[PDB]
Scaffold this active site. Structure first.
Site, short mmCIF file in Angstrom:
data_model
loop_
_atom_site.label_atom_id
_atom_site.label_comp_id
_atom_site.label_asym_id
_atom_site.label_seq_id
_atom_site.Cartn_x
_atom_site.Cartn_y
_atom_site.Cartn_z
N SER B 45 29.25 -62.21 -3.81
CA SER B 45 30.12 -63.16 -4.54
C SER B 45 31.23 -63.77 -3.71
CB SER B 45 30.83 -62.52 -5.74
OG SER B 45 29.92 -62.25 -6.81
N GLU B 143 19.84 -64.20 -7.40
CA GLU B 143 18.91 -63.97 -6.31
C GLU B 143 19.58 -63.79 -4.95
OE1 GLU B 143 16.31 -66.14 -9.43
OE2 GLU B 143 18.39 -66.27 -8.77
C1 LIG Z 1 29.23 -61.10 -6.79
O1 LIG Z 1 29.33 -60.31 -5.85
C2 LIG Z 1 28.69 -60.71 -8.17
N1 LIG Z 1 27.73 -59.65 -7.94
C3 LIG Z 1 26.54 -59.58 -8.62
O2 LIG Z 1 26.29 -60.45 -9.48
C4 LIG Z 1 25.57 -58.41 -8.42
C5 LIG Z 1 25.97 -57.21 -9.22
C6 LIG Z 1 25.97 -57.10 -10.58
C7 LIG Z 1 26.44 -55.82 -11.07
C8 LIG Z 1 26.81 -55.01 -10.05
S1 LIG Z 1 26.61 -55.76 -8.52
C9 LIG Z 1 30.01 -60.38 -9.04
N2 LIG Z 1 31.11 -59.99 -8.18
C10 LIG Z 1 31.67 -58.84 -8.14
C11 LIG Z 1 32.80 -58.77 -7.03
O3 LIG Z 1 33.45 -59.82 -6.90
O4 LIG Z 1 32.92 -57.70 -6.41
C12 LIG Z 1 31.26 -57.56 -8.77
C13 LIG Z 1 31.95 -56.42 -8.81
C14 LIG Z 1 29.92 -57.58 -9.51
S2 LIG Z 1 29.58 -59.12 -10.35
#
Ligand SMILES: *C(=O)[C@@H](NC(=O)Cc1cccs1)[C@@H]1N=C(C(=O)O)C(=C)CS1
Ligand SMILES: *C(=O)[C@@H](NC(=O)Cc1cccs1)[C@@H]1N=C(C(=O)O)C(=C)CS1
EC number: 3.5.2.6
Lengths: 268, 268
Positions: B45, B143
Site C-alpha cells: 500500500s 493483486e
Molecule cells: C496495503 O498495503 C493494503 N494491504 C492489503 O490490501 C493486503 C492485506 C489485507 C489484509 C492484511 S494485508 C492496506 N494497507 C495496510 C497498511 O497500510 O499497512 C494494511 C495494514 C492492510 S490493508
C-alpha cells in the site's frame, strides 16, 4: 557410516543458486551419503512412482485390476499427457496408465489412477502403510506443482523417498511379481536421461522417476542402480530455489548424483 | 557521507528471518544511512502516498479537481475500505478519497484514484516525471500485493522511495500549496503508530505512509521527520522474507528506523 567421505555439495548448490537435497544408500554395507536429506522438497511428478507401487499393492488383492479397461473423456486430459491423449477414443488398461505415468510422466494418466486410489489422501495412506511418516500428497495435478517456499503440501524428504523406494523395489513391501513389475516400469522410464542416469555407466541397470514443477527452480529424480558385481544403490536428488522465475537444472541433478556415488566409494 | 557510523542491520534482519532495506537522508548535511538500499522490495500500500502526490500535481492544472464529487457502486468496494464503505450511498470528493487512501490505507479509494490517473502506467509515468527511474506499478489492488520472491512488478527500492519523497514534500516537484497539503495528509496518517513513528520522539512532527502485503513477511513504511532545531530527515524501511507464510513484524520496522536515526547522529 554416514558421510565417511565429504563431498562438495555446498559449492554445487551455490553455483546453482538454490538448495540441493541428497540421500544415497549402499544396500550392501549400509553406508550412506546425506546432504539436506531431512528437509522437505516438492515432489512434483515424482509422486507418480509411488502411485504405481500403490496400484501394484492393490492388485495383490484384486487379481483382475491391472488388465481392467478404463475409458475417459476429453475433460480428463490436462497439459503434458502424451500417451493418454493417443488413447482418448479407445481407453487404456490400469497397467497401461501406470506405465504411462511412470515412463512418460503422463499427467492425465496419473490423475485417473489417483482417483482410483481415493485421491491424495489415499496415496498418503499407502505410504503410511509401508512406514513412511514424511510423505504427503495434498492436491491434484497440476495444482500440486506450485512449489511455494515454506509450503509443506505435496512434499517429502530425500531420505524418506530413498527409504520407501528401497522397501518397494528391493525389500518386502510388495510381493515378488509386483516388485519386479515396479522395477521394470522404472527401468523403462524415458524422461530421465539427463539426470541420475547421466552419472551412471551404460553397462549398469538403472530405473528412475523424475519430477519437474516448472517454478522455483524445483526438479528432482530418484533411482535404483545395480552396479555389476556389488549390491544395488538407492538414491534421491531434489532441488528448489528462492525465486519463482528461477530455472531448474538437469546438469545439477546429474552432478549431485555423481558426488553421491563418489561419496559411497563406487567406482564409475 | 554514506554510513559514517555502522549499525547492526544484519543482526536485526537475521533475527527477523528475512531481508530489511533502509535508506535515510539528513537534508541538512547530506549524510545518509544505507542498507540494501538499491534492492527491490514490494510496495504494497505504500504506492498510495505517491498516488496522492500525483493527484495533487494534476490539481495544479485543474483548479476544480480536488472538490470534484465521485460516486461509485458496491462493486468498487474491495476488502479493507473502512472510509469509502461509509460513503457508498453518497459519494466522496477526490480530496476525500486521497485522504482516505493515505490516512486509513483505504483500498477502494486508491483503486478509484488510480483509474482517474490512467492506471498503474499513469502513476509510473508521474514518478518518471519527477526523475524516479526505479518505481514501477504494474497491477491493481489487491493483486499487486502478491510479493512473489524475485518478481519486480509493483516494487521500488528504499533509496528511490526516499529520494522521491524528499522531492515531493521538501523539494520543488509540487507547488507550495500542494506540497503542504501532501505533508498534511502524511502527518494525519493513522496506520503507522507501531512503525517509524514508534522510534520518533513525541515532540517531533512526522508524516508517513505504510504498506502491508499480507504474505512473504512483506511490510514497509516511509516518513518525513522534523526534529526540532535541525533540518528534516527523510527515510524508508522495507521488509520481505523467503516463505509465503512468514509473518511481517512492525517491531522490526521500528527498530530499523531507530538504527537509521542513530546512524545519522540524531539524538532522540
Ligand atoms: C496495503 O498495503 C493494503 N494491504 C492489503 O490490501 C493486503 C492485506 C489485507 C489484509 C492484511 S494485508 C492496506 N494497507 C495496510 C497498511 O497500510 O499497512 C494494511 C495494514 C492492510 S490493508
Ligand atoms: C511432473 O513433474 C509433471 N510436471 C508438470 O506437470 C509441470 C510442468 C509442465 C511443463 C513444464 S513443468 C510432468 N513431469 C515431468 C518430469 O517427470 O520431469 C516434466 C518434465 C514436465 S510434465
Amino acid at each position: 557410516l554416514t558421510n565417511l567421505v565429504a563431498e562438495p555439495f555446498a559449492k554445487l548448490e551455490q553455483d546453482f543458486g538454490g538448495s540441493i537435497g541428497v540421500y544415497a544408500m549402499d544396500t550392501g554395507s549400509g553406508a550412506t551419503v546425506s546432504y539436506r536429506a531431512e528437509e522437505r522438497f516438492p515432489l512434483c511428478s515424482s509422486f507418480k512412482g509411488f502411485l504405481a507401487a500403490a496400484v501394484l499393492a492393490r492388485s495383490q488383492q484384486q487379481a483382475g485390476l491391472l488388465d481392467t479397461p478404463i475409458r475417459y473423456g476429453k475433460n480428463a486430459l490436462v497439459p503434458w499427457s502424451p500417451i493418454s491423449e493417443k488413447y482418448l477414443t479407445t481407453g487404456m488398461t490400469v497397467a497401461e496408465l501406470s506405465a504411462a505415468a511412470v515412463q512418460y510422466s503422463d499427467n492425465a494418466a496419473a490423475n485417473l489412477l489417483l482417483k482410483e486410489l481415493g485421491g491424495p489422501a489415499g496415496l498418503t495412506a499407502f505410504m503410511r502403510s509401508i512406514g513412511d511418516t514424511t510423505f504427503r500428497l495434498d492436491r491434484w495435478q497440476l495444482e500440486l506443482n506450485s512449489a511455494i517456499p515454506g509450503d509443506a503440501r505435496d512434499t517429502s524428504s530425500p531420505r524418506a523417498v530413498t527409504e520407501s523406494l528401497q522397501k518397494l523395489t528391493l525389500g518386502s513391501a510388495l510381493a515378488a511379481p509386483q516388485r519386479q513389475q515396479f522395477v521394470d516400469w522404472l527401468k523403462g522410464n524415458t524422461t530421465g536421461n539427463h539426470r541420475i542416469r547421466a552419472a551412471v555407466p551404460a553397462d549398469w541397470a538403472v530405473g528412475d522417476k523424475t519430477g519437474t514443477c516448472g517454478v522455483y527452480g524445483t526438479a528432482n529424480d530418484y533411482a535404483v542402480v545395480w552396479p555389476t558385481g556389488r549390491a544395488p544403490i538407492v538414491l534421491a536428488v531434489y532441488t528448489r530455489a528462492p525465486n519463482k522465475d528461477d530455472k531448474h537444472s538437469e546438469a545439477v541433478i546429474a552432478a549431485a548424483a555423481r558426488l553421491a556415488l563418489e561419496g559411497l566409494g563406487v567406482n564409475g
